[PDB]
Design a protein around this ligand. Structure first.
Ligand code: WAP
Length: 331
């Protein structure tokens, strides 16, 4: 009879202090550009809700990326657009450049700045220890910004990070799952990719916040420093929690569940079992050691907690000793 409520420990009331129209995205009327300014060059991808193309803007010969949407509810498009507009100009956030509709096909299309992304297949296997720190820092810039701006991404994962390694340039993309944080709001748990889902999603706690992003970020980091993609390799949503439980241990899981008075889907009773909390050494090997340091491990531990309220904030993370060499070097 009742899960215990949660609020975010930071940036809690940011949207409340803004005018309505900032977060009330169903109000948003869309500014349409001229679709004849863009010619499609080649397909790049086929996401869940979109097909993605490289294009040229013929007015200025600018290279651009075009996301043509499949049928989605207008208020979700208004949501994606509103968040992009609110965040435009923020550090390492992708820039929305324009919005167009095919006059006949009535299909909306988002137009983005092009990033010359070297492929995350082969990039991630040439990344030095310093490289990872630098790019982890650059993602945290984006996350602290969007959080301070009342937004949670909700789909942080390698595919949604664009890196031009030649120009040491990073952009957090795909804001189509992002939502505004409002104290006491119960969100949809059917979000994020399986391997990147935090416990709150898996146990069905809806009153989550920005700290979801910090779990996902931990997942990314783990896979990068231990060179194990994906780090938590679940067979389905249920088993994903088990993979977490096999590392973080069942004791803290049940403490988390008590505190928030969560009702576990009675299925979980079977397969969760009892499991100790493992040390990170069980994942350190000769081919990864050159990426793992005590400071990296300390950092990771403080991202990957069941209790969303005890995970580092983006700002806290940025102050971690893991990034001292990076922070000092960025002068
Ligand atoms: N935004 C952006 C951007 C910017 N650059 N870029 C590149 N650059 C190509 C490698 C040169 C690829 C690329 N690919 C891609 C593939 C599937 C889905 C999405 N997506 C989903 N939601 N928004 C976007 C994007 N996206 C981008």
């Amino acid at each position: 009879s009742g899960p215990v409520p949660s609020r975010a420990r930071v940036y809690t009331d940011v949207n409340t202090h803004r005018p309505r129209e900032y977060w009330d995205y169903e109000s948003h009327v869309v500014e349409w550009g001229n679709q004849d300014d863009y010619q499609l060059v080649r397909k790049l991808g086929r996401g869940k809700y979109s097909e993605v193309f490289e294009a040229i803007n013929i007015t200025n010969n600018e290279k651009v990326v075009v996301k043509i949407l499949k049928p989605v509810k207008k208020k979700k498009i208004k949501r994606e657009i509103k968040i992009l507009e609110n965040l435009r100009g923020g550090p390492n956030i992708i820039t929305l450049a324009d919005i167009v509709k095919d006059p006949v096909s009535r299909t909306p299309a988002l137009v983005f700045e092009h990033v010359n992304n070297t492929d995350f297949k082969q990039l991630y296997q040439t990344l030095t220890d310093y490289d990872i720190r630098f790019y982890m820092y650059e993602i945290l810039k984006a996350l602290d910004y969007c959080h301070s701006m009342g937004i949670m991404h909700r789909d942080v994962k390698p595919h949604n990070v664009m890196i031009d390694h030649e120009h040491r340039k990073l952009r957090l993309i795909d804001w189509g799952l992002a939502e505004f944080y409002h104290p006491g709001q119960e969100y949809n748990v059917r979000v994020a990719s399986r391997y990147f889902k935090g416990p709150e999603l898996l146990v069905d706690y809806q009153m989550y916040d920005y700290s979801l992003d910090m779990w996902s970020l931990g997942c990314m980091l783990a896979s990068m420093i231990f060179r194990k993609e994906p780090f938590f390799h679940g067979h389905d949503n249920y088993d994903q929690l088990v993979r977490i439980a096999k590392v973080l241990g069942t004791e803290d899981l049940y403490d988390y569940i008590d505190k928030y008075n969560i009702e576990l889907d009675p299925r979980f009773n079977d397969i969760l079992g009892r499991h100790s909390r493992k040390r990170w050494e069980r994942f350190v090997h000769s081919e990864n050691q050159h990426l793992v340091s005590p400071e990296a491990l300390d950092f990771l531990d403080k991202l990957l907690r069941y209790d969303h309220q005890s995970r580092l904030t983006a700002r806290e993370a940025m102050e971690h000793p893991y990034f001292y060499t990076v922070v000092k070097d960025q002068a």
